[PDB]
Symmetry: D2
Subunit: 217 residues, 4 copies
């Protein structure tokens, strides 16, 4: 059942609901099974983030929900399902998604920052690994957000851990700001899990330097 569409962007009511007291929906990003965020043109990436944010924020205005979640799963280690490039909008009747997240989960080491947008790496992440926070203070900076998401995603798929293949996008409307948390997803090394013996560098300053090389142009 079609909720809204814009070209190849399609917003569907999820046919397989698994969460009680929730309105589950799926957002198809393209009519092609090859393309994703790293491949999309600047216009398609701009239109996709504008469509997603608009329908997320307008559904929250519906008094039948306490809060509405907007998020993405990509790769076999994100927790997704469909092979097609898609996002999800879940309206929740009794759950407030901000409840168990704090302000300091979105603060950190600045990679890029100006009056319009801020890109940082969490020094107090939600789960304890790498989390990239992209914050805008005005809705008019949505095209800047879309560009920062695309570059951070491109970095995760290409240079972070010499290619990571899986990630998540999480959106938040907190303190009148729109935040996108970009989270790489990977099977952690057994030597790190049991003995905190890293293979690569665990330095947040090294991630900062190599991610900053994606905003040099």
């Amino acid at each position: 059942d079609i909720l809204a569409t814009e070209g190849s962007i399609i917003w569907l009511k999820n046919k397989f609901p698994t969460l009680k007291d929730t309105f589950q929906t799926v957002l198809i990003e393209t009519d092609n099974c090859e393309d994703h965020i790293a491949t999309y043109t600047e216009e398609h990436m701009r239109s996709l983030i504008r469509f997603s944010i608009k329908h997320w924020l307008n559904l929250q205005k519906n008094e039948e929900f306490t809060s509405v979640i907007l998020y993405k799963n990509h790769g076999p280690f994100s927790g997704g399902s469909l092979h097609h490039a898609h996002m999800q909008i879940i309206g929740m009747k009794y759950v407030n998604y901000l409840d168990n997240v704090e302000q300091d989960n979105f603060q950190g080491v600045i990679v890029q920052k100006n009056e319009h947008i801020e890109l940082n790496i969490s020094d107090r992440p939600i789960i304890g690994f790498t989390e990239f926070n992209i914050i805008i203070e005005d809705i008019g900076c949505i095209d800047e957000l879309a560009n920062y998401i695309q570059q951070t995603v491109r970095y995760i798929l290409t240079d972070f851990h010499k290619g990571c293949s899986s990630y998540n996008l999480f959106f938040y409307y907190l303190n009148e700001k729109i935040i996108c948390k970009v989270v790489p997803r990977f099977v952690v090394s057994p030597l790190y899990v049991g003995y905190k013996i890293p293979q690569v560098s665990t330095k947040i300053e090294d991630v900062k330097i190599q991610l900053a090389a994606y905003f040099t142009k």
Copy 2:
């Protein structure tokens, strides 16, 4: 190249070394590709842990190594490689595996405890999720350790998260004690990663109760 064998238990020098200044070895647990820890007889489970611990502790006595690691990977989310049931012994020339682990990573909520052995759940885990610590104070309690590993593994594969399919074993020789940390491995739910919205119960007391039901006999 064969290092030691005992029936179907085979200790091999790893033919694909990927870590410099380390002696990598593989320990094949059975001559069958169907059996694993949850399936093995009490005798085979006893013989496998006795063989593994003996060769781990004797290799550390070799002055060419600072420390020697004994660990296992099981399932597609552990970080392993071979489909066959195997463990690994890695001799490290300049690394001490205890360096970045602390005493409190092995303390916790007691599930089972007596003069010979202790089974607990980490209240200060190494990575931040569920970690089962099995501690013995004397080498003579090795058959008790083997039984506790098998039951904890059986619980992880059967009831924890209604079946977990993947886990890790990590062995430590700390404060003159032999510790086995049993760690379930699973792709964390996206709603938990980004919003700490759990699907199941996150209560350590609930895990304690349902794991204790495996030691009722």
Copy 3:
């Protein structure tokens, strides 16, 4: 300026406000400078918690506040000011005190539990040390809460670290439950701060056993 009184219990508008966009108040617990929670009779402890909770919850109903905080400071390491036995009620126009606290900060190792009340020790504390959570699901169990606070306070001042002298009380209205978090306050040992070398036992199970000895009667 008197807001409400009940015998020696006096609710005053704080004459020294230091927080902008907040209504600061002070709650004097007794007309004596010798008595405190550990000394008070069962009736005075019951009347003090009933008065405090009632005025805290009724002030939150005032549309001029986003949230209202109810808390106590005791001893020279709590962050208090007056030597007299007092509590504080702070009405906040734009701050929601639940924002940066999560559900798991109130879960833990059960010390005492029944259908009416639950006493636990945080396995995921807010700050990282010992935190005692006393939870009631119905307002009618307020006299049970008052008794559990008094015993937990008595334990902190007497046996925890062989006498702790300082603590905090924090009240929360979360998921239709009334929670009191009892937090001991002490200058942490320098050997622990810099090297995690403890003087006493850091085991949550040992605190559980010795606190349970205060509910044996």
Copy 4:
């Protein structure tokens, strides 16, 4: 009982031992009760750190100790005792002070860095608050370490939290490096302890900027 002296620098065997299987000593920094690290001349600060490090590292060479700790307590919230400006050297027969500290407790956000020395703020602190790590890779850079300690201390006593009055110094000999962890000590705000409502900025990037202003000359 005098162990070593250099002008007003006096190394004494602690007359009040309270730790069994340890050799406790006290290091008096000056013959005056007014002076401390922030006041000392560049020469006295250089001579004090050279004397302290030399006697710390030489005592560890004594086979009667597993490890030797070098640390300082300053102010009423550090955990010290004497009002006089002093440090402590504790030889421990069976304890290795590195056991429960990891490599990542000394990594972080770089404030100052060159080939000789590195000053950072912990992104993974030992206790969870602000920790300043000063690392040198060669013993010849000891006068640079002494200057960085003095400036970081001066900042803590003057601008951090508009004056902090208390701090700790912790020294470590790890991975053939000499590390000094400078830790401010203060009574945490009750609104932060119970509700993570900060009074000041909790941003590591703000501390980085204002501490960097002490190395502008």
